[PDB]
Amino acid sequence: HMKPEIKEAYMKTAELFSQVSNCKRMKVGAIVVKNGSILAHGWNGTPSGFHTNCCELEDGSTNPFVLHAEQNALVKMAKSSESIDGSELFCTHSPCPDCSKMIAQAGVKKVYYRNEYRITDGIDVLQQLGVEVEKM
Template identity: 45%
Template sequence: MKTKHIRAYMKTAHAFAECSTAVRLNVGAIVVKDNRIISIGYNGMPSGWDNNCEMEIDQALKSKPEVLHAETNAIAKLARSPESGQGASMFITHSPCLDCAKLIYQSGITEVYYETEYRDSAGVDFLRKCEVGIHHLP
């Protein structure tokens, strides 16, 4: 994939992250196949729910357990479309957690691009074991 396209797709993932109503962290994800964006996602509450993503616990904001990660939302939208994730690439503003990494692998996505590291590397480690291409962008 051309460098200018990689940059443009990552900018697009960041643009969708801005759609998130979360206070703590805004994450965006897009799925690209054959130079076309085939799905998008950002972290938030399930469709139709109140968009308040956090709750206060011990004077700190914590994500509600119902919050969907950007990758999960993008893959769920992809599953409801006529498109397939087989051989696609995912661009994420942050590296995936382990649960999202498992969904990425199972959906057939073969390349993952991200900028910011998640708090642990289990998701990236899992994808590497599955031979999914991992690209950490500066």
């Protein structure tokens, strides 16, 4: 059903859209895949129309205004006319615990990720809520 070739293609598509991020700390990308369709592609950045597109606060920390690639993928799916329920998620980085909570409640059956985010606990949050997790 989901061959190693297409599964690689979706993950590489995630890596492409992470490069669109203006982020200095980490460039993150998220892809929502359902029935051979990419319904959303999210990357980390400040809100639409924000006074700056810089993700960092001058103290070295990420601005609390910036949205995570997963949040942007969820928000897009809410603005979309297609359901996120039953879809799969291709992330460049494992989602944070706050995001993993929403991803599970959204009805995403499986999360694919390539790299580990500094907070690993999101993986456990996903599996504890009945979401499959595969590192590739």
